[PDB]
Design a protein around this ligand. Structure first.
Ligand SMILES: *[C@H](O)[C@H](C[C@@H]1CCNC1=O)NC(=O)[C@H](CC(C)(C)C)NC(=O)[C@@H](NC(=O)NC(C)(C)C)C(C)(C)C
Ligand SMILES: *[C@H](O)[C@H](C[C@@H]1CCNC1=O)NC(=O)[C@H](CC(C)(C)C)NC(=O)[C@@H](NC(=O)NC(C)(C)C)C(C)(C)C
Lengths: 300, 300
């Protein structure tokens, strides 16, 4: 038992990290087969189309550790640059590029000068920022999930907002949210709490022995979403309810009954008490996360 | 900027995880050079001496993926079993075995059937338990730090205490704490909050732009330790003060001044406020963890 903010083992992704240097800029790239993916502002209101037409392959220095990777071609796809190199990465895992929905979680492998510094778990916030941990040089670090043997890359890091939160793209270079990779006024936008994730984490607490916050009540989905509005929370759909089905069957707690508990927690607070070691209602665990950690899924 | 509970990249350790099956017990081992390290209870008031002498090499089934390693010798060291295999692990990293002090943190690679399930950060609590996330089959998962190129293994997992927390050994088989690998009554014993770590985390908050908890007051090391006792905090030593020196110099906040801030947080609570996204005072970041993550150290 126990419950931790658990990242996926980072091994398959560490094997893909490289360093991309162009001009006075150095950042990270993701090397899959014979392509290196990296944020396009490595060539830096910019006009990346002109900026890139004026590049040559030899302007791009790519180290894979202590082995210079030679660029033989390049193209831009949205906000990422794809550098064709003359060597296929022999450590390339089985992989998939996926664009995730807000509320979904992923692991981030934070990197500098092409070498991993740390791994941690994040969520795509409803306002399409992530509350990451990134310093100068971290751009190009990626976010990912693992499904059995396959790495699903869902994020690459581009920039930090004035509020200290982070914005980036899918691996096809499309920003999550309204953000752009130019230095102009941009702000996150009002965030909300991910309701279905809070519910899942309350099921995790029950699976792990915490029951103090349960009650005999129930609510309707409509009356529950009515209190969720006030507390800044996302609407819970019948689809969310179906998704919480397995967790509700494992625990014997009807999904609407757990909603009644979350209502009482928003209305009354925790009164100096904790849940799974937190004094706040946690929303960066998805229903699938809870089942994975509480049932012991592995990856190969 | 930002601050997350960050684990070390797990790749180097993933390359060392194997499955060890003996009789009807299955768990993980750590394969380094031609030695597989695993908890000795895989051969189960037992008497592991008699129990081991009645074993043969062919009783131990060591799965390294879809490759069965062959045991050619076994030896017990304290509570760990060392299986000599006829194949050196080609993925063996540069490594050390270290036995850490309480208050030190480390990354845990949770595994089942030789296959890593997830990575998370832990502290050795002052009562020599860890608050981990472990299910049946997780024994033999390891904890570790990485220093430039070197993996320092500091923990191997053995058992769960009735309170939901975890006990294990160093890699030389010595338990942390008074615990033993015997099904007999054992309990964590009273824990305390790691004071030097809370202070480091407050410095982390300051580096990241939180200052709301600061004050103009100061305190003597004596008078600070006096309130810490009342709140079940560890005594802060002059050595702890020295250790917090670099964080104090970078932030301009004298160590005893940040102590006066912790005192007021202890006496007044946060009154609905948060620090680094937490409504509790966090003590699982060491002063080195803070400097590492706030200055961007990497590993190769
Ligand atoms: C790439 O390594 C770097 C990563 C950030 C550096 C500090 N923390 C980070 O996450 N990104 C980067 O340099 C950005 C480059 C562009 C995408 C803007 C071209 N620059 C920034 O993130 C900057 N923020 C910023 O200017 N924000 C607004 C005004 C909203 C565009 C800085 C964090 C100030 C460098
Ligand atoms: C090995 O995979 C396993 C890991 C635990 C299983 C669930 N969570 C865990 O961390 N350990 C294990 O099977 C232990 C075997 C001995 C070390 C006791 C020989 N058994 C336990 O951890 C058990 N706990 C227990 O009996 N604790 C006291 C009473 C303090 C000895 C169980 C968790 C009940 C299996």
């Amino acid at each position: 038992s126990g419950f931790r903010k658990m990242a996926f083992p980072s091994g398959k992704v560490e094997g893909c990290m490289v360093q991309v240097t162009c001009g006075t800029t150095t950042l990270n790239g993701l090397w899959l087969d014979d392509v290196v993916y990296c944020p396009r502002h490595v060539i830096c209101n910019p006009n990346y189309e002109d900026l890139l037409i004026r590049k040559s392959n030899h302007n791009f220095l790519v180290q894979a550790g202590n082995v210079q990777l030679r660029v033989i071609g390049h193209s831009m796809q949205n906000c990422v640059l794809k550098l064709k190199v003359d060597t296929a990465n022999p450590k390339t895992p089985k992989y998939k590029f996926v664009r995730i929905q807000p509320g979904q979680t992923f692991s981030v492998l934070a990197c500098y000068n092409g070498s991993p510094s740390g791994v941690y778990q994040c969520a795509m916030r409803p306002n399409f920022t992530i509350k990451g941990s990134f310093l100068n040089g971290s751009c190009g670090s990626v976010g990912f999930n693992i499904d059995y043997d396959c790495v699903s890359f869902c994020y690459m890091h581009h920039m930090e907002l004035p509020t200290g939160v982070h914005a980036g793209t899918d691996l096809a270079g499309n920003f999550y949210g309204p953000f752009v990779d130019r230095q102009t006024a941009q702000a996150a936008g009002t965030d909300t709490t991910i309701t279905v994730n809070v519910l899942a984490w309350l099921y995790a607490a029950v699976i792990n022995g915490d029951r103090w916050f349960l009650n005999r009540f129930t609510t309707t989905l409509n009356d529950f979403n009515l209190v969720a509005m006030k507390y800044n929370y996302e609407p819970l759909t019948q689809d969310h309810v179906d998704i919480l089905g397995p967790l509700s069957a494992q625990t014997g707690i009807a999904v609407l009954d757990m909603c009644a508990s979350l209502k009482e927690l928003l209305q009354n607070g925790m009164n100096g008490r904790t849940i799974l070691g937190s004094a706040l209602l946690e929303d960066e665990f998805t229903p699938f996360d809870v089942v994975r950690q509480c049932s012991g899924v592995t990856f190969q």
